[PDB]
Design a protein around this ligand. Structure first.
Ligand SMILES: *C(=O)[C@@H](NC(=O)CCCC[C@H](NC(=O)CN)C(=O)O)[C@@H]1N[C@@H](C(=O)O)C(C)(C)S1
Length: 345
């Protein structure tokens, strides 16, 4: 690979601050050589500076943790990817023909209930932040809508799919998703900054605060740090750090977290757009220099995450800006992948 470009990374963070992120940071593990940069503040009211050791909410990167657990269950013979969801969760879905593989690749047609919840950004956050949902509650919200496509027929990202994932994990194992994440992933990889505390609202230890951008341009930022994330759970509630997401996606891509056969299934790509694919709880992004990288993005209120690794896991990058509902920041932070993998032009 090209050398990572730290000057480029510094400019990405500086641009993200100019666009409204209180703080922005990035860590690269380049085959045992670390790159780490941060600019701005973890807490904009106290002025405490952001650092790459600050814990944060990873949002939908959680789906890759859920998918690893599920694929280990496939390895153990407890789950068949082409079986019906309803084989395992009787009566859950009205169409007993929707399969686990379709759910995990966002081809199931299940409507994304969060499109109800967050039509208005700050009101929607205020609605859900202190609510506790069951898994079934969220499925019922989705099923108020008809499916958006026939089973398998179309890619349509939906949080509901990884609510199903968490239900599958809990049913098949008899354990909570927190226990399964801990025993199958966090403990074996020594992810000392990684937690699943749902429905607790506290982020353990030193953390970046999250700042939700209101829909009104120029409006005052909302501290969105402390919330249950119960509207997402196994689709979105993990807490981690740049180092630990780097460790995780390197371990995934280098073949440490499941059989070779199941990693292959995880990397069967459904087209998302002309430069992106989706596997089983995993994204592929194609970079300008002809490199593809593998991992996941997250958007949860106040936090935008990118966490991606090269195909063999030897280079991994995690970037965080502590705002959300700010498309300019989201698009800027993607540039960390170009600077970290493609290097200086
Ligand atoms: C995962 O991160 C998941 N995120 C969400 O579903 C986002 C929830 C609302 C976020 C909120 N937006 C609004 O309130 C909009 N009015 C905000 O704080 O910005 C899905 N994962 C990502 C990812 O995979 O990139 C998606 C953007 C695709 S949605």
């Amino acid at each position: 690979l090209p050398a990572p470009d730290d000057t480029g990374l510094q400019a990405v963070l500086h641009t993200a601050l100019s666009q409204g992120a209180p703080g922005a940071m990035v860590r690269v593990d380049d085959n045992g050589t670390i790159h780490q940069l941060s600019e701005g503040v973890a807490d904009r009211a106290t002025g405490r500076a952001i650092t790459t050791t600050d814990r944060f909410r990873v949002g939908s990167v959680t789906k890759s943790f859920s998918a690893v657990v599920l694929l280990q269950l496939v390895d153990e013979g407890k789950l068949d990817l082409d079986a019906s969801v309803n084989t395992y969760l009787p009566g859950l879905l009205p169409d007993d023909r929707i399969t686990v593989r379709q759910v995990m690749s966002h081809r199931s047609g299940l409507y994304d209930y969060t499109n109800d919840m967050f039509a208005q950004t700050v009101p929607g956050f205020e609605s859900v932040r202190n609510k506790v949902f069951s898994y079934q509650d969220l499925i019922t919200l989705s099923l108020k809508h008809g499916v958006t496509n026939a089973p398998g027929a179309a890619y349509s990202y939906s949080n509901t799919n990884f609510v199903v994932a968490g239900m599958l994990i809990e049913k098949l194992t008899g354990h909570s998703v927190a226990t399964e994440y801990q025993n199958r992933i966090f403990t074996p990889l020594n992810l000392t900054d990684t937690f699943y505390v749902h429905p607790d609202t506290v982020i353990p230890g030193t953390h970046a605060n999250g700042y939700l951008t209101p829909d009104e341009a120029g409006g005052a930022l909302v501290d969105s740090t402390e919330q249950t994330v119960s509207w997402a759970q196994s689709a979105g509630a993990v807490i981690s750090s740049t180092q630990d997401l780097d460790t995780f996606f390197s371990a995934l891509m280098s073949g440490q977290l499941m059989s070779a056969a199941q990693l292959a299934q995880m990397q069967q790509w459904t087209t998302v757009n002309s430069t992106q694919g989706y596997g089983l709880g995993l994204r592929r992004r194609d970079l300008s220099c002809g490199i593809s990288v593998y991992g996941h993005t997250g958007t949860v209120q106040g936090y935008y995450t990118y966490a991606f690794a090269s195909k063999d896991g030897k280079r991994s990058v995690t970037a965080l800006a502590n705002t959300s509902n700010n498309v300019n920041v989201l698009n800027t932070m993607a540039r960390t992948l170009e600077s970290a993998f493609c290097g200086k032009p």
